[PDB]
């Protein structure tokens with residue numbers, strides 16, 4: 001049997017461990033954290049993720065989709081909150097087949113861990129990768145207390161997240177051609193209790209947004225009607241706008257409360273533990289990291305966040321990481337040798353990872369914000385109705401289909417260009433020749 005060592009029992013690592021182990025590979029998975037399945041008296045994390053078609057299909061191939069979805073809340077659309085007006089729902093898709101699912105990260109990880117072990121993978125927790133000796137095919141791991149342990153490896157998979165130790169180790173043997181692009185927004189997680197969400201009639205079957213231009217809040221529901229709120233706000237106020245809100249101005253929980261009372265007045269009464277959450281939850285960082293190289297011969301490869309950290313605004317980090325795990329397991333299973341599998345995997349996935357990194361950055365303006373846009377959107381809706389296999393809004397191609405990300409971006413561009421020229425110099429729909437716009441759709445967009 002072929003052997004593989006995987007670093008990181010996260011989302012991509014555990015899925016790839018299950019896929020390889022059920023195909024007879026000898027799989028050893030190393031994880032820095034403790035096993036979340038061992039019940040402790042600790043107060044566990046309430047992180048929510050939006051699972052879409054790419055991630056759902058990956059779980060489906062692994063036989064874990066039904067179990068994951070039993071524990072997922074349907075989000076039918078985007079509920080936009082602007083003070084004084086009732087929330088505007090905005091369906092994501094055409095029917096209940098075109099939805100996103102809100103899943104608790106810890107519930108998903110336990111399912112994936114059980115799945116990897118059921119398939120035959122051995123999982124070793126409380127062991128963090130420190131360094132790799134590529135020449136001797138040996139790695140060094142340690143616990144939190146610093147006690148070191150060495151292990152031999154044949155194939156190394158770096159599924160160890162955005163601050164990947166495998167990626168850092170690879171940089172000593174190859175030029176990764178690494179380009180880090182920082183993002184000015186930090187993030188803070190806040191809670192809405194089931195009692196508060198019910199009292200304020202917050203819809204459980206939707207993704208909620210409180211747009212505020214340069215900053216915003218989002219909320220994802222849980223099975224028990226609680227919601228995890230995420231505030232996106234600049235770490236620092238720019239030089240040009242020193243008065244503009246930022247985390248640097250929010251000195252403590254009380255300042256955060258004052259800020260929410262002023263800027264998010266319909267949201268502040270639902271956040272009962274705002275002051276404590278603000279002070280005890282750390283401010284997260286966001287970034288895009290692009291690498292020219294994802295592998296070292298046939299010895300090691302990166303996937304998921306280890307390969308392509310992206311900004312969170314499209315909810316595609318996990319979906320892309322799960323899609324990578326399927327592609328990696330497929331390439332490894334059927335290749336002539338590991339070196340061929342890793343080069344083929346990298347060549348296939350890199351253009352698509354670059355496309356989703358770009359689309360995730362573009363989605364911030366779509367969430368946090370024009371009559372021209374409204375007319376384009378209305379025309380876009382008519383074209384999707386008239387031509388459903390040709391005109392598919394970019395959000396739907398990314399979220400509800402498995403079309404390669406680079407193709408969704410290219411088609412999305414043809415559509416934006418088509419709508420722009422069609423609405424130009426028209427105040428409303430009545431002056432636009434709809435049949436001529438439809439002819440342009442049939443001429444420029446091949447059916448999918």
Ligand SMILES: Cc1cc2nc3c(=O)[nH]c(=O)nc-3n(C[C@H](O)[C@H](O)[C@H](O)COP(=O)(O)OP(=O)(O)OC[C@H]3O[C@@H](n4cnc5c(N)ncnc54)[C@H](O)[C@@H]3O)c2cc1C
Nearest residue numbers: 008010011012032050129161165304305315316317318319
């Ligand atoms: C709060 C939050 C919400 C998110 N919401 C969404 C969402 O709505 N939709 C979406 O698609 N994506 C979302 N994402 C992004 C998504 O979580 C990631 O893109 C995804 O988890 C990447 O999967 P991964 O397996 O590559 O990495 P991870 O899931 O981060 O797993 C990496 C694993 O490696 C372990 N590890 C790290 N360093 C070492 C080491 N040196 N040695 C050993 N083990 C190590 C970590 O402990 C972890 O278990 C969210 C991210 C955050 C932070």
Ligand SMILES: C[C@@H](Oc1cc2oc(=O)n(CCC(=O)O)c2cc1Cl)c1ccccn1
Nearest residue numbers: 048049050078187218230312313314315367
């Ligand atoms: C929860 C996640 O934030 C998102 C998840 C998301 O899922 C999605 O479908 N979208 C787009 C929704 C839309 O355009 O209507 C989306 C956006 C964000 Cl910021 C997050 C929290 C904190 C750190 C990193 N990630």
